[PDB]
């Protein structure tokens, strides 16, 4: 008896979740508009950075989530980072945010601006009152960095030790091996891989909400 | 030299916090607007809530740790007559404030139909202009009156005790009224635990009122 109306009330909660999805959609719209309003402030930052040394490198180093990715040999690279901003998707397409990292001319790659994107959700998943605590993160878009010759750090040219068959003589062979670096999540794992996806999602969320709109507090 | 540039960055961050405060005020306004869309669903819930769902909100309290600890065996029969809990919001132009209306059906314990424990949140860029900090956070409650019938109160309980006279030690076998732990103390905040009451109200604001289904069926958890 009661269970029937409880189930109907659950179906009602599903519509409540849909309404909340529309709420968060317009929340993203407000985020975009107010970001247009932030643009003068972020631009004034940009010109001010022209400059606070290694600004965003220090910002990342001071955050627990991000210091984990920045390796020592990375410091010469990320230090040439000149700015970071967030762009928000326009109406009609699925909600997403694009973190854009503006890099000055360097000796490590030619990309004036590098891009990376996160697509959020805007809908529930079934007829049960499924979880949606705002726009969460599924998937992510890696990109290729226009590295200079042999300047890639995501892969390291290790002189792996090998032995000749039968003879047994030792030798060194130059082979590319996956290397840990701050740039590694720019090539996220494809469709422990899921754990790394979740970690990257959380890191990008922290970049969007905490790092970028409050970069000064983290310097 | 660099100090001047970082100071400029901080002052830009101050405007940043101001614009973010405007953003959050607009977010509250959009929540008010989406109320017009929400309350049809919560009104269907009200009407549907053996007739209806007995002790729906008491059961929700029990299945929430933040609320089960606040429900006492004596309270349960009284709070059983809790008809609904629903959230209202402040009008345009007012400081961000919302109300957790406990609508309560007629009973034998207390009379007033509703208990409206208003809340409020910070709406300023920061306490100090040089510094910067923001985000919606409860900076104050309001509480509301609670009447009672003769002997039906539970916030303060009447007992017979052999008390010890203060400063003389004499024994007095007399009746006394002593403050008692009860659920309805939730409606009586300390006139300026405060943080705990604030967070519990915020929980009822964002989880238990909006998504009551998840916490009633056992389909959601909180610690």
């Amino acid at each position: 008896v009661v269970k029937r109306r409880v189930n109907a009330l659950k179906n009602l909660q599903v519509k409540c979740a849909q309404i909340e999805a529309k709420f968060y959609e317009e929340v993203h719209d407000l985020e975009r508009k107010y970001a247009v309003l932030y643009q003068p402030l972020f631009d004034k930052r940009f010109e001010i950075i022209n400059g606070i040394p290694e600004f965003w490198l220090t910002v990342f180093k001071n955050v627990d989530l991000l210091s984990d990715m920045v390796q020592e040999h990375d410091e010469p690279i990320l230090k040439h980072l000149k700015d970071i901003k967030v762009k928000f998707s326009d109406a009609g397409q699925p909600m997403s945010f694009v973190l854009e990292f503006h890099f000055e001319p360097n000796e490590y790659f030619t990309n004036e601006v590098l891009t990376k994107t996160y697509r959020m959700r805007s809908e529930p998943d079934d007829s049960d009152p499924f979880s949606f605590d705002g726009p969460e993160i599924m998937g992510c878009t890696g990109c290729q960095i226009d590295w200079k010759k042999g300047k890639n750090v995501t892969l390291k040219t290790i002189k792996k030790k090998q032995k000749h068959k039968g003879r047994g003589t030792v030798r060194t062979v130059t082979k590319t091996v996956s290397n840990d670096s701050f740039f590694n999540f720019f090539a996220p794992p494809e469709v422990d891989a899921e754990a790394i996806l979740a970690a990257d999602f959380e890191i990008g969320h922290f970049l969007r909400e905490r790092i970028i709109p409050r970069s000064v507090l983290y310097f | 030299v660099v100090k001047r540039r970082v100071n400029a960055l901080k002052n830009l961050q101050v405007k940043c916090a101001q614009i973010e405060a405007k953003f959050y005020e607009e977010v509250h306004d959009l929540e008010r607007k989406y109320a017009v869309l929400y309350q049809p669903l919560f009104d269907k819930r009200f009407e549907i809530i053996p007739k209806g769902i007995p002790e729906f909100w008491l059961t929700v309290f029990k299945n929430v740790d933040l609320l089960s600890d606040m429900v006492q065996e004596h309270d349960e029969p009284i709070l059983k007559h809790l008809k609904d809990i629903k959230v209202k919001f402040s009008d345009a132009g007012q400081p961000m404030s919302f109300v957790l209306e406990f609508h309560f059906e007629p009973n034998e314990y207390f009379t007033n139909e509703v208990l409206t424990k208003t809340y409020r949140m910070r709406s300023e860029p920061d306490d100090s202009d040089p510094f910067s900090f923001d985000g919606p956070e409860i900076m104050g409650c309001t509480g509301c009156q609670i009447d009672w019938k003769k002997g039906k109160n539970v916030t303060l309980k009447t007992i017979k005790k052999k008390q010890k006279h203060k400063g003389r030690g004499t024994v007095r076998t007399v009746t006394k009224t002593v403050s008692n732990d009860s659920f309805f103390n939730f409606f009586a905040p300390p006139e300026v635990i405060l943080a705990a009451d604030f967070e519990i109200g915020h929980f009822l604001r964002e989880r238990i009122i909006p998504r009551s289904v998840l916490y009633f069926t056992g389909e959601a958890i909180e610690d």
């Binding site: 049960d128 979880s131 969460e136 979740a198 | 740790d65 998840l214 389909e219 958890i221």
Partner: protein, 649 residues
């Protein structure tokens, strides 16, 4: 004397506070397991609380002056247990009571329908009850990150429960901002990859047995419950407990036959190393007397022995040709241990896995009875008696011609660069001819020039003194890149030297079993004169280097001096009786000069011991067993020399 040994329970100061710990490593390393990490600390600063006597362990009384040995049968552990999360401590709780935390564990032997096997790996799943009241199951790999015992309480972000199976209760909605709190009800084993070893009374079954077939898998049992081992205590109501103290009171069967049951372990200390001629009651042995026990079918079982006397009494058995029974050939007391050797095949000792051969079929050895039969705990079903018969267990010259059935054949030696090998051997021969003043000498066959053959004389004041030893050396194809392939001609049916194996193998650092292309046969001969033939050859098997100055070291070294004297006399006897086809004339000449001096010296040792002691290497406490064995072999050596035509000087 050393007073701590592996796994022993100790009390000492860590971080300035007294704490319990287990010694893990010795020549000491102590891990204060309750809360701490391994660190080195000496025993003088420490206070023992419970020694780690475990079955199969040979022990000696700490206080009793009698150095008699004994093997430990069973150990009774009265252990204090602290409940986890809480701090209630119950003492004394007997370890036989405590049960393992998981039904099966990594590598603990198991038995399938009719197969034995080690669980190489086991996939296990936890069963959780949520504050919501929902019961679920999860693989431990996912649960590793939940901020594992029945009754635990943990917390976890909702997403961790994405892959679980919701056994019962209302399924909660998984939101990234929800944190479930879980109480672990039971820990279960999902699958297990069995690395089978033996079939027990076709082909192996499936490696990863399906969960539905785990009900037939039976673990192994024994109690080695160490400090800090999670387990489940049952009230006289399973509760997760950690052992905080242990009370090792073990039963000991001593070398005199007495069984001193319930002796505090602190009064015992184990012997890391036996002289290979000790034989605690039950150790199966075979005779080495030339005349006695001509039939190979007979074997021996030692009943008791006197350590100071180095003499043990044995029973000789042989199998019945019909049926599966055994008969007693006879009891022989006063038998020197040197005349008996650890039986090649039967090596039964406590807690040794065994399989029944032509009902329970897989088990462990508990005690080897002084009688013929042996005691096996089949799983934990019952201790049963079974014969060994059906219980499987788990100077220089260049001689001409070629060596006749000698040195190295079947080789077809072919150096990749013969010219460089010749270049090497030229300088090797020059060095050998130039720097061999200690009498040691070598020779090379014309055919297969790599076939070196050397005779080595023992130094003075050592059991091998006047000891002649023949070595055949095959030079490798890629010499001098790698050490030479040595082979000691072995005929004594014994180990005259901890490295000179009866199989013909030799062992020393220079032989790579350090070396360099600059290394030469001269260096190897120098080493053989310095290490292989040394004053106390007991110090040359896979270590014992710590023993310098240890009383156990001295005792075992004296016994090994005795055994080496017996075996060198045996080797000389054989060599005189049946010498090879090479190196013969010099063997004659050596035996004429000093060969009879060996027997005279040994007899002088015996006479001096009887009267009471000379000097030269540890032999002074000559023992009844040594006297008997040395006389029995020395009369044989005299007979061989006489029949060989070597008259006394």
């Amino acid at each position: 004397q050393r007073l701590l040994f592996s796994h022993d329970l100790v009390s000492g100061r860590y971080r300035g506070s007294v704490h319990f710990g287990l010694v893990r490593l010795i020549h000491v390393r102590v891990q204060w397991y309750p809360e701490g990490v391994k660190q080195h600390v000496k025993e003088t600063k420490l206070k023992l609380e419970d020694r780690s006597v475990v079955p199969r362990d040979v022990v000696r009384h700490m206080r009793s002056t009698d150095s008699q040995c004994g093997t430990v049968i069973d150990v009774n552990i009265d252990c204090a247990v602290k409940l986890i999360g809480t701090n209630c401590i119950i003492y004394p709780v007997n370890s036989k009571d405590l049960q393992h935390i998981w039904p099966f564990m990594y590598g603990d032997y198991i038995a399938y329908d009719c197969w034995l096997g080690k669980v190489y790996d086991l996939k296990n799943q936890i069963i959780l009850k949520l504050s919501n009241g929902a019961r679920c199951s999860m693989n431990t790999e996912d649960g590793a990150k939940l901020y594992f015992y029945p009754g635990q309480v943990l917390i976890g972000p909702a997403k961790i429960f994405s892959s679980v199976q919701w056994l019962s209760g209302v399924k909660p909605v998984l939101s990234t901002k929800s944190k479930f709190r879980v109480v672990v009800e039971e820990v279960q084993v999902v699958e297990l990859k069995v690395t089978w070893i033996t079939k027990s009374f076709v082909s192996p079954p499936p490696s990863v047995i399906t969960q539905e077939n785990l009900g037939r898998v039976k673990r192994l049992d024994h109690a080695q419950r160490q400090l800090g081992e999670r387990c489940l205590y049952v009230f006289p109501d399973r509760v997760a407990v950690e052992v905080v103290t242990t009370m090792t009171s073990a039963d000991v069967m001593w070398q005199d036959g007495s069984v001193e049951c319930n002796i505090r372990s602190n009064d015992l200390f184990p012997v890391h190393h036996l002289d290979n001629n000790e034989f605690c009651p039950g150790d199966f042995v075979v005779d080495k007397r030339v005349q006695s026990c001509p039939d190979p079918a007979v074997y021996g079982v030692v009943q008791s022995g006197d350590h100071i006397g180095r003499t043990c009494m044995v029973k000789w058995f042989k199998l019945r040709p019909s049926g599966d029974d055994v008969e007693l050939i006879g009891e022989e007391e006063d038998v020197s241990v040197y005349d008996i050797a650890d039986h090649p095949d039967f090596r039964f000792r406590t807690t040794d896995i065994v399989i029944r051969i032509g009902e329970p079929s897989v088990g462990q050895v508990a005690r080897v009875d002084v009688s013929s039969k042996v005691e096996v705990v089949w799983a934990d079903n019952s201790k049963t008696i079974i014969l060994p018969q059906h219980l499987y267990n788990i100077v220089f010259s260049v001689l001409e011609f070629a060596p006749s059935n000698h040195s190295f054949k079947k080789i077809e030696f072919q150096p990749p660069e013969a010219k460089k090998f010749f270049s090497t051997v030229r300088k090797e021969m020059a060095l050998l001819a130039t720097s061999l003043p200690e009498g040691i000498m070598v020779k090379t066959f014309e055919d297969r020039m790599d076939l070196f053959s050397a005779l080595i004389k023992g130094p003075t004041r050592t059991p091998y003194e006047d000891g002649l030893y023949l070595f055949d050396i095959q030079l490798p194809n890629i010499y001098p890149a790698v050490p030479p392939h040595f082979c000691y001609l072995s005929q004594c049916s014994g180990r005259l030297n901890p490295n000179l194996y009866d199989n013909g193998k030799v062992k020393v650092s220079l032989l790579g079993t350090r070396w360099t292309s600059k290394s030469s046969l001269l260096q190897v001969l120098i080493s053989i004169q310095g290490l292989i033939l040394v004053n106390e050859p007991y110090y040359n098997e896979a270590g014992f280097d710590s023993d310098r100055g240890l009383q156990e070291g001295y005792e075992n070294s004296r016994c090994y001096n005795e055994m080496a004297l017996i075996r060198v006399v045996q080797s000389m006897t054989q060599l005189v009786r049946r010498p090879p086809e090479v190196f013969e004339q010099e063997i004659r000449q050596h035996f004429s000069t000093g060969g009879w001096r060996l027997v005279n010296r040994i007899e002088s040792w015996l006479e001096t011991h009887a009267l009471l002691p000379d000097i030269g290497f540890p032999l002074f406490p000559l023992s009844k067993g040594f006297i008997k064995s040395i006389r029995g072999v020395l009369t044989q050596f005299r007979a061989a020399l006489l029949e060989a035509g070597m008259p006394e000087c």
